[PDB]
Design a binder for this molecule. Sequence first.
Ligand SMILES: [Zn+2]
Ligand SMILES: [Zn+2]
Length: 217
Amino acid sequence: SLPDLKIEKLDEGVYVHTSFEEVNGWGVVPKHGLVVLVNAEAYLIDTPFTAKDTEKLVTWFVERGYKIKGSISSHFHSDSTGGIEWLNSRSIPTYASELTNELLKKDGKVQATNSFSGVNYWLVKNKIEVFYPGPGHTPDNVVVWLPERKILFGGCFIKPYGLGNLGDANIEAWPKSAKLLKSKYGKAKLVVPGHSEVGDASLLKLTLEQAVKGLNE
Ligand SMILES: [Zn+2]
Ligand SMILES: [Zn+2]
């Protein structure tokens, strides 16, 4: 019996959703995503692990007068993509990078309906920016920038306390990717990691340090 899905307002037009998975390796793991409001429309930044929690998340927003316009998954792991099957089945548009969709296809997983490539991709012009810093936590990890609030969703790329599971990681590339990310979004007010507490721009520096330290060893 996992903890309940949580939805908490972070800032004007921005909510953090927290869902939980059981893992023999630590135990129960929280995963943070966002919901971003754009004029009575809602965008999912990462899905919960499960169809059920994705449905609970959509319904919470639909019952408050928001149309779910889309989801974007920051990387191929189930903690960002677990909801894509359900969203596709409800004809809610799903987004992931060409790299993410290729990794989903390789692993026998259902793909996002819409894909993008390049360093920069606007999901919503001037409101929701996707940035590819390069390989790190996974080959495909992207971040999501909300320029109006200076909020960065770093997702599972942001690892200020330790790099965690290296199974899909590029330890050689991560320091370069993290250097690029810190340069691009050094002015971030809020950085939202995948698996630890919301913080300021310092999580970018801490991530860089862990990536450097991880490569050295
Ligand atoms: Zn991951
Ligand atoms: Zn993760």
